[PDB]
Design a protein around this motif. Structure first.
Motif, mmCIF file in Angstrom:
data_model
loop_
_atom_site.group_PDB
_atom_site.id
_atom_site.type_symbol
_atom_site.label_atom_id
_atom_site.label_comp_id
_atom_site.label_asym_id
_atom_site.label_seq_id
_atom_site.Cartn_x
_atom_site.Cartn_y
_atom_site.Cartn_z
ATOM 1 N N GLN A 87 -6.047 -25.058 -68.576
ATOM 2 C CA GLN A 87 -6.125 -24.283 -67.344
ATOM 3 C C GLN A 87 -7.477 -24.499 -66.686
ATOM 4 O OE1 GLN A 87 -5.442 -20.206 -68.448
ATOM 5 N NE2 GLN A 87 -3.513 -20.641 -69.514
ATOM 6 N N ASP A 88 -7.454 -24.934 -65.425
ATOM 7 C CA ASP A 88 -8.636 -25.009 -64.571
ATOM 8 C C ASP A 88 -9.683 -25.997 -65.079
ATOM 9 O OD1 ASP A 88 -7.251 -22.881 -63.375
ATOM 10 O OD2 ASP A 88 -8.426 -21.394 -64.482
ATOM 11 N N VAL A 89 -9.396 -26.685 -66.187
ATOM 12 C CA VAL A 89 -10.314 -27.712 -66.669
ATOM 13 C C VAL A 89 -10.356 -28.882 -65.694
ATOM 14 C CG1 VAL A 89 -8.489 -28.655 -68.129
ATOM 15 C CG2 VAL A 89 -10.883 -29.222 -68.607
ATOM 16 N N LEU A 90 -9.223 -29.189 -65.068
ATOM 17 C CA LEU A 90 -9.122 -30.240 -64.068
ATOM 18 C C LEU A 90 -8.945 -29.622 -62.689
ATOM 19 C CD1 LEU A 90 -5.798 -30.513 -63.240
ATOM 20 C CD2 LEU A 90 -5.760 -31.413 -65.577
ATOM 21 N N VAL A 91 -9.603 -30.215 -61.690
ATOM 22 C CA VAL A 91 -9.506 -29.746 -60.314
ATOM 23 C C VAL A 91 -8.548 -30.584 -59.482
ATOM 24 C CG1 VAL A 91 -11.837 -28.810 -60.430
ATOM 25 C CG2 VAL A 91 -11.462 -31.113 -59.522
ATOM 26 N N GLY A 92 -7.949 -31.620 -60.064
ATOM 27 C CA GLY A 92 -7.056 -32.490 -59.333
ATOM 28 C C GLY A 92 -5.659 -31.917 -59.185
ATOM 29 N N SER A 93 -4.806 -32.700 -58.523
ATOM 30 C CA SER A 93 -3.417 -32.307 -58.318
ATOM 31 C C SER A 93 -2.629 -32.256 -59.619
ATOM 32 C CB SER A 93 -2.738 -33.264 -57.338
ATOM 33 O OG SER A 93 -2.711 -34.585 -57.853
ATOM 34 N N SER A 94 -3.144 -32.871 -60.683
ATOM 35 C CA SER A 94 -2.542 -32.855 -62.014
ATOM 36 C C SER A 94 -1.951 -31.505 -62.413
ATOM 37 C CB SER A 94 -3.574 -33.292 -63.055
ATOM 38 O OG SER A 94 -4.267 -34.451 -62.629
ATOM 39 N N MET A 95 -2.602 -30.405 -62.030
ATOM 40 C CA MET A 95 -2.048 -29.067 -62.226
ATOM 41 C C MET A 95 -0.574 -28.971 -61.840
ATOM 42 S SD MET A 95 -3.382 -26.352 -63.550
ATOM 43 C CE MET A 95 -5.091 -26.807 -63.273
ATOM 44 N N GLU A 96 -0.190 -29.637 -60.750
ATOM 45 C CA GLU A 96 1.210 -29.752 -60.357
ATOM 46 C C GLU A 96 2.045 -30.297 -61.506
ATOM 47 O OE1 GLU A 96 2.697 -29.721 -56.829
ATOM 48 O OE2 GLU A 96 1.022 -28.366 -56.405
ATOM 49 N N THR A 97 1.781 -31.550 -61.884
ATOM 50 C CA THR A 97 2.542 -32.165 -62.960
ATOM 51 C C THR A 97 2.234 -31.523 -64.301
ATOM 52 O OG1 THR A 97 3.169 -34.274 -63.972
ATOM 53 C CG2 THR A 97 0.849 -33.970 -63.425
ATOM 54 N N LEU A 98 1.087 -30.855 -64.430
ATOM 55 C CA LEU A 98 0.796 -30.107 -65.647
ATOM 56 C C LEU A 98 1.829 -29.008 -65.861
ATOM 57 C CD1 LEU A 98 -1.035 -29.584 -68.041
ATOM 58 C CD2 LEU A 98 -2.509 -28.239 -66.541
ATOM 59 N N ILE A 99 1.974 -28.116 -64.878
ATOM 60 C CA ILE A 99 2.954 -27.039 -64.993
ATOM 61 C C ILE A 99 4.367 -27.602 -65.060
ATOM 62 C CG2 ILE A 99 3.702 -24.844 -64.036
ATOM 63 C CD1 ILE A 99 1.054 -24.811 -62.479
ATOM 64 N N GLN A 100 4.663 -28.620 -64.246
ATOM 65 C CA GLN A 100 6.003 -29.199 -64.263
ATOM 66 C C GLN A 100 6.362 -29.704 -65.653
ATOM 67 O OE1 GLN A 100 6.209 -32.166 -61.197
ATOM 68 N NE2 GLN A 100 6.131 -30.677 -59.519
ATOM 69 N N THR A 101 5.489 -30.519 -66.250
ATOM 70 C CA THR A 101 5.762 -31.079 -67.564
ATOM 71 C C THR A 101 5.779 -30.001 -68.635
ATOM 72 O OG1 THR A 101 4.562 -33.019 -66.778
ATOM 73 C CG2 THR A 101 5.153 -32.954 -69.104
ATOM 74 N N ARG A 102 4.947 -28.968 -68.492
ATOM 75 C CA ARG A 102 4.924 -27.898 -69.481
ATOM 76 C C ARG A 102 6.255 -27.163 -69.521
ATOM 77 N NH1 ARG A 102 -0.031 -24.978 -67.729
ATOM 78 N NH2 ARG A 102 1.513 -23.499 -66.916
ATOM 79 N N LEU A 103 6.760 -26.766 -68.350
ATOM 80 C CA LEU A 103 8.054 -26.094 -68.302
ATOM 81 C C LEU A 103 9.189 -27.036 -68.689
ATOM 82 C CD1 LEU A 103 7.529 -23.944 -65.093
ATOM 83 C CD2 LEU A 103 7.045 -23.407 -67.479
ATOM 84 N N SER A 104 9.083 -28.317 -68.315
ATOM 85 C CA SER A 104 10.118 -29.276 -68.683
ATOM 86 C C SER A 104 10.199 -29.423 -70.192
ATOM 87 C CB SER A 104 9.843 -30.622 -68.020
ATOM 88 O OG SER A 104 9.568 -30.455 -66.640
ATOM 89 N N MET A 105 9.053 -29.383 -70.871
ATOM 90 C CA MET A 105 9.083 -29.589 -72.306
ATOM 91 C C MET A 105 9.504 -28.312 -73.005
ATOM 92 S SD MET A 105 5.793 -31.977 -73.064
ATOM 93 C CE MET A 105 4.662 -30.964 -72.123
ATOM 94 N N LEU A 106 9.162 -27.151 -72.443
ATOM 95 C CA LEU A 106 9.721 -25.906 -72.958
ATOM 96 C C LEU A 106 11.243 -25.958 -72.944
ATOM 97 C CD1 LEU A 106 7.498 -23.056 -71.524
ATOM 98 C CD2 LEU A 106 8.114 -23.390 -73.911
ATOM 99 N N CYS A 107 11.824 -26.322 -71.798
ATOM 100 C CA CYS A 107 13.281 -26.351 -71.683
ATOM 101 C C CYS A 107 13.894 -27.380 -72.627
ATOM 102 C CB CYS A 107 13.685 -26.644 -70.239
ATOM 103 S SG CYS A 107 15.460 -26.882 -69.997
#
Ligand SMILES: CCCCCCCC/C=C/CCCCCCCC(=O)O[C@H](COC(=O)CCCCCCCCCCCCCCCCC)COP(=O)(O)OC[C@@H](O)CO
Ligand SMILES: CCCCCCCC/C=C/CCCCCCCC(=O)O[C@H](COC(=O)CCCCCCCCCCCCCCCCC)COP(=O)(O)OC[C@@H](O)CO
Ligand SMILES: CCCCCCCC/C=C\CCCCCCCC(=O)O[C@H](COC(=O)CCCCCCCCCCCCCCCCC)COP(=O)(O)OC[C@@H](O)CO
Ligand SMILES: CCCCCCCC/C=C\CCCCCCCC(=O)O[C@H](COC(=O)CCCCCCCCCCCCCCCCC)COP(=O)(O)OC[C@@H](O)CO
Ligand SMILES: CC(C)CCC[C@@H](C)[C@H]1CC[C@H]2[C@@H]3CC=C4C[C@@H](O)CC[C@]4(C)[C@H]3CC[C@]12C
Ligand SMILES: CC(C)CCC[C@@H](C)[C@H]1CC[C@H]2[C@@H]3CC=C4C[C@@H](O)CC[C@]4(C)[C@H]3CC[C@]12C
Ligand SMILES: CC(C)CCC[C@@H](C)[C@H]1CC[C@H]2[C@@H]3CC=C4C[C@@H](O)CC[C@]4(C)[C@H]3CC[C@]12C
Ligand SMILES: CC(C)CCC[C@@H](C)[C@H]1CC[C@H]2[C@@H]3CC=C4C[C@@H](O)CC[C@]4(C)[C@H]3CC[C@]12C
Ligand SMILES: CC(C)CCC[C@@H](C)[C@H]1CC[C@H]2[C@@H]3CC=C4C[C@@H](O)CC[C@]4(C)[C@H]3CC[C@]12C
Ligand SMILES: CC(C)CCC[C@@H](C)[C@H]1CC[C@H]2[C@@H]3CC=C4C[C@@H](O)CC[C@]4(C)[C@H]3CC[C@]12C
Ligand SMILES: CC(C)CCC[C@@H](C)[C@H]1CC[C@H]2[C@@H]3CC=C4C[C@@H](O)CC[C@]4(C)[C@H]3CC[C@]12C
Ligand SMILES: CC(C)CCC[C@@H](C)[C@H]1CC[C@H]2[C@@H]3CC=C4C[C@@H](O)CC[C@]4(C)[C@H]3CC[C@]12C
Ligand SMILES: CC(C)CCC[C@@H](C)[C@H]1CC[C@H]2[C@@H]3CC=C4C[C@@H](O)CC[C@]4(C)[C@H]3CC[C@]12C
Lengths: 298, 298
Positions: A87-107
């Motif tokens: 969280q907040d370690v990166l300031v780039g757009s990666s946060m987008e794909t970060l949350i996307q991939t996190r929820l995708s892997m949860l599912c």
């Protein structure tokens, strides 16, 4: 209304915006990483146990291939738990794909953990209480793997639809809101930064409803196979424990991540704890009796 | 700070503002009323049938008391369905009381419909599985009524907590929001009216999670008793059909009533249709077989 005029008046002061900062306590990150690492060591130990033991009769009884699938799902869930502590370690757009991939892997991990157990219970049902004159000669693992693959295909179709129709736009909004009652008037200056998507409740409802129908059928199958065999192969107890734990954890974490997007440590600790508890409970319920009976063998 | 003054000036420029109200087309109201009237006629018919023929083998075996409790729950559910169509009539403070009473009767009716069936299934399970020397002499009807009453009391505790902790206050909010995604600046002015609580998702999640745990245990009980008795008594099929229909309808109605508050006719029609389908399906599954074997036997 002078609201439109002040629109462009605040647009000039809207030239800049907060870039967000990190506020996740190191101690909490260390503790959660340690606990998830212990869980991953346990999962790898179970993988090695099932790989090395493929000739024991408990192995033949407990369907080691489907257990490998379950362990892969557990590995995906712990990977998602790790990514939750980014969280907040990166300031780039990666946060987008970060949350996307996190929820995708949860599912994907939840599907890959819960599908195989229901498949094993469905075979057990169909092979014990369907001794019709036409003998159930063989119902191989391939069919259960196909059912799990179809469920994964449905989940990933939902994921593609969600990603390609409404992604998680990371936006920050500042807005003055004039909440007025029937007789009272009030004004507020609310400014919040949340990474969320429009129609978020739509996607949550679809994914959670699909998983809920899956869990209802799993409870039905656990009921059918409740008193049909030994606990190492019955899997009714683990199905029910996992289903109620999943419902409780899912509801709690959804409420916490919604109404407490101002307590990052609390949200992260609760999410990591819920994923850890659910995954560890499922894997332990599946594999500990196998270890006990193998040790009783030799 | 610069926006502060503009917002203060805007609040003073309120000038009493304005309010918006509308009425549904007087055709959907008529269709909804007549269909729920036919449903209530059916429910009262089953009520009279049980009251008048609670001495036959099939009816006595089908637990007439639990069925009349279910019928009372269905009557409450259709009363709530009626109250969905009396909306946009109580312009004053009674609108909040209208929504509160409507949702309260939804919860009470769902509990009163889905409690007795699970009670019946649990007795059936305990009488067809307690072959122990400690004979299950009689598991009284008063115990099943006790469990149903306890669940109703739990629902009333949850409802009282919701009402007296975060009730439904009707608020009209018009505000200007400036969205900044990090690359573009956008301004929007929205004047929206909705009646909701400040912690709506908390209460929805808690109530629906308690009901979900109930539905999961009901699916488990339907699994245990799935192949144990005759249909007129098994009640596994009705439990499963009702549970899946309830989950689908609940999710669909949640999404529509959240993201389509600007489509009043669609929300009203969908809510009435979901309630009508669920309640009628449950009651028909409960009672149509009873009629069939009664007429066959007489
Ligand atoms: C399956 C269903 C049932 C399962 C149960 C569902 C939930 C599962 C949950 C377990 C909960 C974990 C414990 C919760 C601890 C959360 C920490 C917290 O919430 O307290 C903090 C206050 O202290 C801190 O600042 C953090 C520093 C100390 C952290 C260690 C404390 C607990 C030590 C270790 C915890 C790790 C546990 C390791 C175990 C396995 C987990 C893998 C909130 O601070 P804040 O948010 O910043 O507030 C200020 C705001 O204004 C702006 O900062
Ligand atoms: C077997 C026969 C029975 C068949 C019944 C079928 C179910 C039919 C209904 C589902 C809900 C009906 C739709 C009306 C409810 C929403 C209308 C409403 O009042 O609004 C609410 C606001 O209220 C609240 O704040 C608290 C709501 C408490 C809900 C009590 C229980 C409901 C129902 C409990 C009964 C069932 C539990 C779940 C079942 C089993 C589960 C599968 C949502 O807020 P919002 O509009 O999104 O806010 C917009 C944004 O701007 C600001 O939040
Ligand atoms: C394997 C053994 C068991 C494993 C244990 C699994 C634990 C599950 C627990 C908790 C879920 C993680 C919590 C994160 C949930 C997403 C929250 C988030 O981070 O982002 C959200 C927004 O997201 C979205 O916009 C789309 C949501 C995608 C949901 C699908 C995720 C895949 C599937 C996810 C479920 C996966 C499990 C399915 C089981 C089901 C059990 C019933 C913030 O919303 P907001 O800020 O309130 O909105 C502000 C408003 O103004 C405008 O939207
Ligand atoms: C199990 C069955 C299959 C599964 C289906 C699931 C649910 C089953 C049941 C009922 C579905 C309800 C159908 C919803 C249709 C009404 C909503 C709609 O679609 O049209 C609305 C309504 O328009 C009108 O006002 C004129 C049309 C009135 C007649 C509607 C015909 C329906 C009659 C239909 C056939 C008769 C059946 C009687 C029904 C028994 C159900 C108890 C426009 O929307 P609006 O909000 O006013 O837009 C304006 C916005 O821009 C700003 O104001
Ligand atoms: C019948 C079942 C199995 C399939 C239907 C699933 C529904 C819920 C899916 C299928 C297509 C999806 C829609 C695809 C595109 C949009 C446009 C977007 O701007 C709002 C969401 C919305 C409207 C989606 C909502 C959910 C949706 C309607
Ligand atoms: C009985 C089981 C198997 C299925 C139902 C379990 C319940 C507790 C789960 C599964 C689906 C979940 C719902 C899915 C849809 C949403 C949209 C979300 O934005 C708000 C909460 C809400 C309404 C969820 C509440 C919790 C929920 C109802
Ligand atoms: C937040 C707290 C207070 C809620 C408590 C939830 C309780 C009721 C849940 C949690 C775990 C559940 C148990 C999990 C597993 C089983 C095994 C099954 O063969 C019988 C039901 C039983 C025994 C469940 C009964 C209900 C249960 C005890
Ligand atoms: C083993 C039992 C106790 C765990 C069951 C989960 C319960 C106890 C957890 C889940 C979510 C948690 C709550 C989440 C958020 C808050 C808001 C915070 O400002 C006060 C603590 C409080 C109220 C937490 C208290 C404990 C809590 C209610
Ligand atoms: C401190 C918290 C957050 C971490 C809890 C870790 C969890 C996964 C641990 C703690 C206690 C463990 C349980 C202890 C006893 C049993 C009984 C056994 O027959 C099945 C495994 C099971 C059910 C274990 C599964 C894993 C377990 C539930
Ligand atoms: C099994 C029993 C004990 C579970 C009880 C869970 C209770 C304590 C949880 C679930 C809903 C939560 C409430 C949700 C809403 C509010 C309103 C808020 O302004 C204060 C916190 C408060 C009051 C919470 C207090 C804790 C709470 C009431
Ligand atoms: C959009 C699609 C995926 C929705 C599919 C809904 C399906 C899965 C629901 C609707 C009807 C339900 C079925 C209703 C009747 C039965 C017969 C019973 O003896 C086993 C459960 C079973 C087989 C249910 C399984 C789940 C079910 C088939
Ligand atoms: C069992 C399955 C088939 C039930 C499917 C019910 C579906 C068809 C119902 C439930 C929700 C309804 C949708 C609710 C919202 C919208 C958005 C609106 O702008 C067009 C109508 C539309 C798209 C409705 C179409 C019909 C709809 C999708
Ligand atoms: C909008 C409203 C009117 C739609 C109503 C659809 C109803 C009539 C449909 C949907 C489910 C269907 C029922 C499904 C199951 C059964 C049980 C069977 O033994 C007799 C037929 C019967 C009873 C069907 C009757 C017709 C039925 C109830």
């Amino acid at each position: 209304r002078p609201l439109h005029d002040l629109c462009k008046t605040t647009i000039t002061s809207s030239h800049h915006s907060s870039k967000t900062i990190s506020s996740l306590s190191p101690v909490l990150l260390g503790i959660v990483w340690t606990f998830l690492s212990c869980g991953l060591l346990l999962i790898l130990f179970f993988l090695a146990f099932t790989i090395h033991c493929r000739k024991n009769r408990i192995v033949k009884m407990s369907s080691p291939n489907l257990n490998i699938v379950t362990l892969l799902g557990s590995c995906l869930t712990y990977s998602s738990a790790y990514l939750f502590g980014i969280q907040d370690v990166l300031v780039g757009s990666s946060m987008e794909t970060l949350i996307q991939t996190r929820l995708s892997m949860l599912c994907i991990g939840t599907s890959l953990v819960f599908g195989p157990i229901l498949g094993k219970s469905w075979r057990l049902y169909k092979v014990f209480t369907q001794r019709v004159p036409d003998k159930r000669v063989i119902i191989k693992d391939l069919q259960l793997l196909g059912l799990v693959a179809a469920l994964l295909m449905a989940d990933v179709i939902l994921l593609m639809t969600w990603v390609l129709t409404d992604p998680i736009q990371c936006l920050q909004i500042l807005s003055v809101s004039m909440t007025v009652t029937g007789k009272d008037v009030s004004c507020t200056s609310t400014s919040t930064h949340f990474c969320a998507s429009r129609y978020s409740d739509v996607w949550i409802a679809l994914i959670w409803g699909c998983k809920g129908l899956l869990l209802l059928y799993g409870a039905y199958l656990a009921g059918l196979t409740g008193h049909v065999s030994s606990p190492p192969v019955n899997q009714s107890l683990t199905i029910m424990v996992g289903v109620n734990l999943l419902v409780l954890a899912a509801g709690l974490l959804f409420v916490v991540t919604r109404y407490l997007h101002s307590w990052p440590n609390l949200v992260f600790g609760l999410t990591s704890g819920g994923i850890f508890v659910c995954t560890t409970t499922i894997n332990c319920f599946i594999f500990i009796p196998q270890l006990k009976q193998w040790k009783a063998f030799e």
